[PDB]
């Protein structure tokens, strides 16, 4: 299809962890979405924030109706499990790298199905907790997912990381490796 | 800024949808997806008018849905009431998002000037996407040896690109750098000169 500009209301509802989602995306960039805990819109940046608005009641009935469908085709395709596609895992900073100089490591997973994940930051072979952040399950036009896991940090001589993933597509856990250079 | 009303029809399972709208000149296309795991099953395309069923799964509701003129014409207001009306508030924001790239020239290893090595362009942190990379030797734009990963998102509403330059220094050989976006009143330079 041709166009300038793609924008796109994506959102899922599943069994397991995470059971539902409800996001807009601009030219593949989540704009905003609905938190369903506490029912209220969260805005990417603050500047989409302060522009616009957004009634997150429109994104809770559309997750009820979508509930509904799952509901139906569970029965429908007597039982209809997909099959677990595995992620591919990069890792790269969001800045040059300076040593002593702040910056943010990017873990990126991609491709995978279904959006049921576990992700773990290592430093020096230990979980960090401090400092991480992470974005939602992205759609892909494939209807695979993707989603980005971050962390903020200083480049060292001395440091070492590792993005751990966890997904039923994998046969053991998936370990990627970063250094500073 | 709003949003339409989706149509009712160890072990998971998951449903699936998208309200997309793709702007084009000054038109509006709109689709609705209705998708199992990751089957498509009901679509409506307003070039089309009406629903069409993608797998014998989703024909109940293609065609009941296509009975009922009032869920039709529901749909096909899409384009001009909910796509015109989003995309004209991204317009006049999203659209005018503006963010100047960083621009670092590194080389990939540092040392001697016998043999090859790799000169990076490393341009981050910039908004929108659209960008011009380009290595220049000696006041020469060099077309080969260019070695580029494509557009890297960041997802944080920020794009970078690393743009790599197969060189072999020789003593005051300057290489520039030049980076163009609609950010920038004038290109960016970058100097790294042989030594
Ligand atoms: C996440 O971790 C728990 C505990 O190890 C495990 O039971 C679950 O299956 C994991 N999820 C994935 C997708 O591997």
Redesign the interface.
């Known amino acids: 299809?041709?166009?300038?500009?793609?924008?796109?209301?994506?959102?899922?509802?599943?069994?397991?962890r995470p059971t539902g989602e409800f996001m807009?995306e601009?030219?593949?960039?989540?704009?905003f979405y609905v938190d369903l805990d506490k029912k209220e819109t969260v805005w990417?940046?603050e500047?989409?924030g302060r522009?616009?608005?957004?009634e997150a009641q429109?994104?809770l009935?559309?997750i009820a109706?979508?509930?509904?469908?799952?509901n139906?085709?569970?029965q429908?395709?007597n039982?209809?499990?997909?099959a677990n596609d595995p992620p591919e895992v990069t890792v790269?900073p969001?800045?040059?790298v300076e040593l002593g100089q702040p910056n943010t490591l990017?873990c990126?997973i991609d491709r995978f199905?279904?959006?049921?994940l576990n992700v773990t930051w290592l430093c020096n072979g230990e979980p960090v907790t401090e400092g991480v952040a992470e974005?939602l399950f992205?759609?892909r036009t494939?209807?695979?997912f993707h989603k980005?896991h971050?962390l903020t940090f200083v480049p060292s001589a001395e440091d070492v990381y590792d993005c751990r993933v966890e997904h039923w597509g994998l046969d053991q856990p998936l370990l990627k490796h970063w250094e500073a250079q | 800024k709003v949003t339409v009303a989706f149509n009712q029809f160890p072990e998971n399972y998951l449903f699936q949808g998208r309200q997309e709208c793709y702007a084009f000149n000054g038109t509006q296309r709109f689709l609705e997806r209705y998708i199992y795991n990751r089957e498509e099953l009901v679509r409506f395309d307003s070039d089309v008018g009406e629903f069409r069923a993608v797998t014998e799964l989703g024909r109940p509701e293609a065609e009941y849905w296509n009975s009922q003129k009032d869920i039709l014409e529901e749909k096909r207001a899409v384009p001009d009431r909910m796509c015109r009306h989003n995309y004209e508030l991204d317009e006049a924001v999203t659209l005018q998002r503006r963010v100047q790239p960083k621009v670092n020239v590194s080389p990939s290893k540092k040392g001697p000037l016998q043999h090859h090595n790799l000169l990076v362009c490393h341009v981050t942190d910039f908004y929108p996407g659209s960008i011009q990379v380009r290595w220049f030797l000696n006041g020469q734009e060099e077309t080969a040896g260019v070695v580029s990963t494509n557009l890297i998102r960041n997802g944080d509403w920020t794009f970078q690109i690393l743009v790599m330059l197969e060189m072999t220094p020789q003593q005051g050989d300057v290489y520039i750098c030049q980076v163009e976006h609609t950010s920038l009143d004038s290109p960016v330079t970058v100097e790294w000169k042989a030594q």
């Not at chain 1, 601009?26 to 704009?31: I, L």
């Not at chain 1, 039982?79 to 997909?82: E, G, K, L, N, V």
């Open positions: 299809i041709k166009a300038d500009h793609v924008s796109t209301y994506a959102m899922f509802v599943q069994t397991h807009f601009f030219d593949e960039d989540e704009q990417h940046l500047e989409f522009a616009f608005s957004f429109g994104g009935a559309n109706i979508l509930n509904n469908n799952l139906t085709l569970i429908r395709s039982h209809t499990q997909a790269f969001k800045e040059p990017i990126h199905f279904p959006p049921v974005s992205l759609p494939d209807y695979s980005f971050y």
